[PDB]
Ligand binder design. Structure first.
Ligand code: VC8
Ligand code: DC
Ligand code: CL
Ligand code: MG
Ligand code: MG
Ligand code: NA
Ligand code: NA
Ligand code: NA
Length: 326
DNA sequence: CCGACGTCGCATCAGC
DNA sequence: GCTGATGCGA
DNA sequence: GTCGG
């Protein structure tokens, strides 16, 4: 990409602040700057030119000038040399190992893939499955494979109850030619904002996907959110497909548009859009958009009959899913 | 300057 | 057990 | 780290 060197540098800084410094707001600010630069349609010539973009301030502009002049960033060259930072950044690549667990593991002398495998009993269930599929989860999913996965999920869900509707969201819905995982929004008319007329609505879909050996492992599961592992079937004598991460979110059927807005993302697009709502005097979540009173307290949900109604309230022109890849 | 920064589900743990 | 952080994830 | 009042 046009400014890939700069955006990679800012992404590495963001990951450092999240994993090592445990500074969540610095992480978000580095990712916001990388995102705005990533869609900037010129090859950046200077820090000053980048500082014109919202989210790029004085410090990033200085780093951009250093990187443009030398091709590298001294602050990052030193981070890469630091063993504790190196170890923490590696351990946090395992699903279920976050910043705190990674620092505790290094304290205990658990620093490598070899160390993790030797100490499975030090791992909670989520972490244990993240270690099991460590290599698989860093592989990307071709859209063609997403389409086969979509076919299985939709057809199995229809076999449980033809009134379910499953919608694949995430980067797939944004039209990406590959995805990092599969995100499935699920609705059923028995589950609305007003009542749950049927129990186990998420459970029985998960069970059916387990029965046909599509879902293979469970990271976490509740009444409305499943987080797990799935795998396409392979043909005779074929090498197996990698195992893939799958998230399934059951959303009240009447709140589908807020739900599909949220689950289509991207994550930065959601942050930007929800920050804009706040400035406009609204709060948006995966269920509702509600006004803010003078006291900063959310009011009653506003009527929503399309994704576009949500954009309208906050005075944004509508953006198709393919233009939300921030 | 400096307060705010998106919002929430599930797993885990501490205190009662 | 309940409740309210806190961790990690979407 | 950046922004807006
Ligand atoms: N911090 C987050 C993370 C995710 N999300 C939402 C938006 C996003 O699209 C998400 C699905 O999570 P994801 O991590 O799978 O994000 P994707 O957009 O699908 C993706 Cl580009 Cl990271 P990938 O999964 O295709 O690699 O749910 C969010 O709102 N806030
Ligand atoms: N998972 C889904 C997807 C769509 N829908 C509903 C919302 C609208 O009434 C209708 C529109 O479908 P679509 O947005 O796919 O054009 O389907 C649902 O209830 N659950
Ligand atoms: Cl709500
Ligand atoms: Mg995804
Ligand atoms: Mg602000
Ligand atoms: Na700027
Ligand atoms: Na992790
Ligand atoms: Na996901």
């Amino acid at each position: 990409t046009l400014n890939g060197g700069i955006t990679d540098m800012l992404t590495e800084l963001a990951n450092f602040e999240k994993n090592v410094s445990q500074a969540i707001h610095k992480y978000n600010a580095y990712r916001k700057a990388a995102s705005v630069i990533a869609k900037y349609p010129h090859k950046i010539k200077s820090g000053a030119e980048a500082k014109k973009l919202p989210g790029v301030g004085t410090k990033i502009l200085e780093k951009i000038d250093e990187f443009l002049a030398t091709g590298k960033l001294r602050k990052l060259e030193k981070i890469r040399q630091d063993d504790t930072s190196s170890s923490i950044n590696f351990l946090t690549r395992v699903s279920g190992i976050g910043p705190s667990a990674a620092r505790k593991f290094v304290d205990e002398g658990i620093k490598t893939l070899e160390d993790l495998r030797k100490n499975e009993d030090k791992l909670n269930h989520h972490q244990r499955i993240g270690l099991k599929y460590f290599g698989d989860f860093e592989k990307r999913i071709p859209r063609e494979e997403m389409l086969q996965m979509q076919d299985i999920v939709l057809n199995e869900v229809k076999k449980v109850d033809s009134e379910y509707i499953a919608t694949v969201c995430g980067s797939f819905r944004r039209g990406a030619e590959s995805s990092g995982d599969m995100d499935v929004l699920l609705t059923h008319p028995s589950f609305t904002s007003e009542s749950t007329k049927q129990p186990k609505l998420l459970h029985q879909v998960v069970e059916q996907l387990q029965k046909v050996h599509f879902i293979t492992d469970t990271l976490s599961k509740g009444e409305t959110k499943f987080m797990g592992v799935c795998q396409l079937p392979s043909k005779n004598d074929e090498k197996e497909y990698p195992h893939r991460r799958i998230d399934i979110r059951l959303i009240p059927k009447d709140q589908y548009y807020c739900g599909v807005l949220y689950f289509t993302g991207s994550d930065i697009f959601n942050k930007n859009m929800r920050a804009h709502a706040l400035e406009k005097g609204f709060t948006i979540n995966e269920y509702t958009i509600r006004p803010l009173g003078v006291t900063g307290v959310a009011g009653e949900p506003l009527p929503v009959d399309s994704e576009k109604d949500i954009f309208d309230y906050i005075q944004w022109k509508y953006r198709e899913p393919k233009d939300r890849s921030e």
